[PDB]
Amino acid sequence: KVQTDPPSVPICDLYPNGVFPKGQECEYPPTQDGRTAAWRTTSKKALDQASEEIWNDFREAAEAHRQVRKYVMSWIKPGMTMIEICEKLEDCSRKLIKENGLNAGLAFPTGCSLNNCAAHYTPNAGDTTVLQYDDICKIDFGTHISGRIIDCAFTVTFNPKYDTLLKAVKDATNTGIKCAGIDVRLCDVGEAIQEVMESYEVEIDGKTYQVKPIRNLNGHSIGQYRIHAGKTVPIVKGGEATRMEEGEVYAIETFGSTGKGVVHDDMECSHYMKNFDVGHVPIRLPRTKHLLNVINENFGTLAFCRRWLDRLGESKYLMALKNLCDLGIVDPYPPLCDIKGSYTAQFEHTILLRPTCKEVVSR
Numbered sequence: 001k002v003q004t005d006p007p008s009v010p011i012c013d014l015y016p017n018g019v020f021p022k023g024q025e026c027e028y029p030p031t032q033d034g035r036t037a038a039w040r041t042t043s044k045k046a047l048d049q050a051s052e053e054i055w056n057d058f059r060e061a062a063e064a065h066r067q068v069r070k071y072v073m074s075w076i077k078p079g080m081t082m083i084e085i086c087e088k089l090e091d092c093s094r095k096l097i098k099e100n101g102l103n104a105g106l107a108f109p110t111g112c113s114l115n116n117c118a119a120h121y122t123p124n125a126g127d128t129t130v131l132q133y134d135d136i137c138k139i140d141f142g143t144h145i146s147g148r149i150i151d152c153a154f155t156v157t158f159n160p161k162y163d164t165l166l167k168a169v170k171d172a173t174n175t176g177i178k179c180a181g182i183d184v185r186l187c188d189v190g191e192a193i194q195e196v197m198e199s200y201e202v203e204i205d206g207k208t209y210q211v212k213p214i215r216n217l218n219g220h221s222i223g224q225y226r227i228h229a230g231k232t233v234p235i236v237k238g239g240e241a242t243r244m245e246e247g248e249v250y251a252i253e254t255f256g257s258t259g260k261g262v263v264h265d266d267m268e269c270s271h272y273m274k275n276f277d278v279g280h281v282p283i284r285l286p287r288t289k290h291l292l293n294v295i296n297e298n299f300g301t302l303a304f305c306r307r308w309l310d311r312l313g314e315s316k317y318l319m320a321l322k323n324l325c326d327l328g329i330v331d332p333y334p335p336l337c338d339i340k341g342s343y344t345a346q347f348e349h350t351i352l353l354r355p356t357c358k359e360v361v362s363r
């Protein structure tokens with residue numbers, strides 16, 4: 001019927017007809033010189049209708065995402081361990097998405113990257129890290145229906161001193177969302193994002209900074225069970241003049257930093273994902289064979305973390321996991337950090353480049 005105070009009712013049950021709510025629908029940006037894109041909404045309808053089941057799956061996943069993040073915003077507080085934050089968020093996500101093997105579930109581990117760490121941090125077992133009042137935490141989580149992934153992220157703070165940094169990144173992300181469209185050059189989206197983000201100056205503990213985009217972090221095209229499908233959306237000038245195409249799905253995201261505006265691999269790895277371009281590899285090594293079978297059954301090509309392997313009842317798998325990485329079957333995705341003492345922020349939405357309109361499905 002209606003959603004409970006702490007959410008527990010799956011999205012599927014809240015919509016008995018199986019028709020999930022649409023995200024924000026936008027007309028495409030004008031075709032430079034200056035031709036209108038409004039014609040698409042009236043043609044394109046046949047091509048849009050053909051993929052209705054696909055858009056409907058993204059919508060169910062997007063509704064689960066909205067209700068989980070509204071729940072997260074109501075209780076996330078300093079003093080909580082990073083493990084409890086991730087477990088509370090994931091328990092709600094599993095329930096609302098109605099987790100069912102590879103058919104419905106979590107598209108990737110909950111990122112909760114702190115301060116100079118911009119992405120790919122999730123605690124492993126035994127991590128005693130506690131969220132602090134002065135922390136800047138990037139909550140980045142994903143849901144999927146039949147591998148139709150919603151990649152959506154926001155930044156959590158408790159100290160108002162970071163307000164302008166968050167506004168800079170939010171404005172840069174909304175710019176990217178507005179600039180995106182069929183036949184738009186990916187380098188143009190990048191330059192517009194940078195121009196907006198770099199117009200902001202911030203003061204944190206008596207020090208001033210110009211907000212800079214993290215040049216080696218970017219938005220990207222999304223494929224079925226494939227978080228990155230091949231096209232990169234830069235967030236600085238100097239990128240590639242490759243164009244966005246009809247029917248594509250993008251994660252439009254920006255990262256702002258008071259640091260160097262560049263990230264490097266740091267800390268213990270938590271995130272792993274099977275390489276999409278590797279076919280069948282016969283393995284005789286028993287622990288390695290077992291772990292690969294666990295990955296193929298539970299995750300396929302979706303990203304996973306060590307906590308999820310622990311949750312499945314696996315143990316003493318670290319060497320088997322390293323073997324899969326050395327064989328090129330699995331790739332590690334360690335935390336990406338800017339310089340010590342720097343602050344990073346992120347905002348992200350998933351968009352559908354439908355033949356009729358641009359739908360910000362996660363908004």
Ligand SMILES: c1cc(OC[C@H]2CCCN2c2ccnc3ncnn23)c2ccncc2c1
Nearest residue numbers: 108111120140151227228271272273303333
């Ligand atoms: C850098 C990062 C990648 O994906 C990292 C993925 C997998 C692990 C976590 N992860 C996440 C988590 C949250 N949000 C995300 N948005 C995009 N990816 N992403 C690559 C994928 C494919 N080829 C090149 C790549 C280079």
Ligand SMILES: [Mn+2]
Nearest residue numbers: 140151152153
């Ligand atoms: Mn993300």
Ligand SMILES: [Mn+2]
Nearest residue numbers: 151251253348
């Ligand atoms: Mn992303």
